[PDB]
Design a protein around this ligand. Structure first.
Ligand SMILES: [Mg+2]
Ligand SMILES: [Mg+2]
Ligand SMILES: [Zn+2]
Ligand SMILES: [Zn+2]
Ligand SMILES: [Zn+2]
Ligand SMILES: [Zn+2]
Lengths: 162, 162
DNA sequence: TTGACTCTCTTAA
DNA sequence: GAGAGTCA
DNA sequence: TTGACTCTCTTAA
DNA sequence: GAGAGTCA
């Protein structure tokens, strides 16, 4: 098994490589009508992506390092969390983008939580709009708002009460 | 079926059958420290479910009727909305449970909206906690809360800024 | 050891 | 959150 | 005609 | 949101 020192070395090489990705400045809603700025370190759209990186899906990548003749591979956003527990409450931990920008690999924009927690950030009002996430959101979720419901609750007769 | 009269007759038969489902009272969080009461009309756990109903998955059912000698079949929660547009902004409209109770077929607990709007209600603070859904929630979403994040954003070196 | 592709899978609406 | 087929 | 089962699919994290 | 194979 890789030692803790070897894992730290993987994290360090990952950070060195991601730190050289293009840094894109994004203005974002924070909630409460306020605007903030996030700086995303974005993996390229096409190969080459950076040392150790390869695309396994339209917006999926992996990081690969060969240590003592053994090939090791990780989901590209999971590397910051290799020294953390990988499950909680019986649920697998997932890399969760606080910036909601899948190409971003900035570890200051990532957290490590259940898929339900991850998804729920899409609708959060944001750090200045009422976020209650214990690990606070960096921005209002992209899907926050009144929604676009086509039809509401209704009945034709009198068979039902709410 | 094709005619508006045929569609209304399908809605009316569906309402009459679902109206005979057992009515189960559920006390629910509303947000803001308040609690409310919903009356769900719950399809039975096992066959027979009711005239026209059959189970196609653990928590999936379909409603079927024979019209002009042809069988017409629908997802069991979609029937109230058969006269509504079946898409919005190019996204498929889905039956969305405001009571978050899949066995419930009370149309006063259903709306018709994109799958994203549907999902997002799981995290809504609720009608007394700040819900901004234009078609208002009936309860706080079951997944609302601080979450259980295992690790937050972090870096080992000095290559990243928020 | 490394890059650039390929494939399928998980979850819960 | 969906559609459709196999039997009786 | 109606009932009770079977199977796979969609979406976007 | 994931893991794993092939080829040079
Ligand atoms: Mg996410
Ligand atoms: Mg729902
Ligand atoms: Zn980012
Ligand atoms: Zn939040
Ligand atoms: Zn209900
Ligand atoms: Zn709401």
């Amino acid at each position: 098994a890789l030692t803790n020192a070897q894992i730290l070395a993987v994290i360090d090489s990952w950070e060195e490589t991601v730190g050289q990705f293009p840094v894109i400045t994004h203005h974002v809603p924070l909630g409460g009508g306020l605007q903030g700025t996030l700086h995303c370190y974005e993996i390229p759209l096409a190969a080459p992506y950076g040392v150790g990186f390869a695309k396994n899906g339209p917006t999926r990548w992996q990081y690969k390092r060969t240590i003592n003749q053994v090939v090791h591979r990780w989901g590209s956003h999971t590397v910051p969390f290799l020294l953390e527990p990988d499950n909680i409450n019986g649920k697998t931990c997932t890399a969760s983008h606080l910036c909601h920008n899948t190409r971003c690999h900035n570890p200051l924009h990532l957290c490590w939580e259940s898929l339900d927690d991850n998804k729920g950030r899409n609708w959060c009002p944001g750090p200045n709009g009422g976020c209650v996430h214990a690990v606070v959101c960096l921005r209002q979720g992209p899907l926050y708002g009144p929604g676009a419901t086509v039809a509401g609750p209704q009945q034709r007769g009198s068979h039902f009460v709410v």
